Amino acid sequence: GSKGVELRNDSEGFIHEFGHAVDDYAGYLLDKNQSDLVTNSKKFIDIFKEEGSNLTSYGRTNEAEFFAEAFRLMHSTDHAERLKVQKNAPKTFQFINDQIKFIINS
């Protein structure tokens, strides 16, 4: 999504969005109904209800954002940023890590 220079929004935005695009392909292929993304499948909105008030305010917007920033944080070059997620959410991290996958390309 990517503005401006790296006042960090560019980079951390682009990968947030990227997580959301992973949720997109995952929802097209997996799940079943209208509900557009793989978010809020598996174990009905559990992970988001608890942990989706802790990672940040974006972790508490739509669940599709909670997942997207969870993706960001999961891979953070600042590895401590990742441990903020596991520490504060010892199941959301594991969720994106369950969905460790291989969408695209490159």
In the chain, domain spans:
1-106
Contact predicate 69/56, CB 8 Å: yes
Q: Running DSSP on this structure, what letter comes out for residue 30?
A: S
**Cβ neighbours of residue 40 under 8 Å, at least 6 residues apart?**
48, 63
20 carries a ligand binding annotation: yes
Distance, CA of 105 to CA of 83 (rounded, Å): 27
Decide if domain 1-106 falls under CATH 3.40.390.10. Answer: yes
**Residue 55, number of CB atoms within 10 A of its CB:** 21
Torsion sign over Cα 71, 72, 76, 79: negative
> Given 17, 50, 63, 69, which residue is catalytic?
17
58 carries a ligand binding annotation: yes
- Is 81 a residue of the active site? no
Task: Note the Cα 70 to chain centre separation in Å.
Answer: 3
79 carries a ligand binding annotation: no
